[PDB]
Amino acid sequence: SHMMLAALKEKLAALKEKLAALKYKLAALKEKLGLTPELAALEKELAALEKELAALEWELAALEADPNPDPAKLAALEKKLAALEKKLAALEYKLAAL
């Protein structure tokens, strides 16, 4: 469980850093391309993924505090973070395609 928790925290931190970088890239594209509806949809998505990462971090905080973290809850968190990473990758592509 300890190794699992360490890997999940490292994954969470990595996605948080990517999130922030894309926020600055999106704002730069808004100033270069204008206030386009495509960018509005990407901004909506980035904001939702930011809300989800914050909620997942509360979940990880609880599991790290638990002296006997539930392995199934740990495995399910890995899957949620992997799903979020896929969405963040799809958003990063779209920003790089503008």
Author numbering: 19 to 116
Publication excerpt:
Here we describe the combination of rational and computational design to deliver three-helix bundle (3HB) peptide assemblies and single-chain proteins with control over topology and thermal stability. First, we garner sequence-to-structure relationships from antiparallel 3HBs in the Protein Data Bank. This gives core-packing rules, including layers of hydrogen-bonded polar residues, which are combined with surface-charge patterning to design complementary sequences for acidic (A), basic (B), and neutral (N) helices. Next, AlphaFold2 models for both designs are used to seed computational designs of single-chain proteins where the helices are connected by loop building. Synthetic genes for these express in E. coli to yield soluble, monomeric, and thermally stable proteins.
To alter thermal stability in our designs without compromising the 3HB fold and topology, we sought to destabilise sc-apCC3-CW1 systematically by modifying its consolidated, largely Leu-based hydrophobic core. All sequences were evaluated using AF2, which consistently predicted clockwise 3HB topologies with high confidence. Specifically, secondary structure calculations from the models all gave ≈74% helical residues. Thus, apart from the 0NTT construct, which coincidentally had 75% helicity by CD spectroscopy, there was no correlation between the predicted and observed helicities.
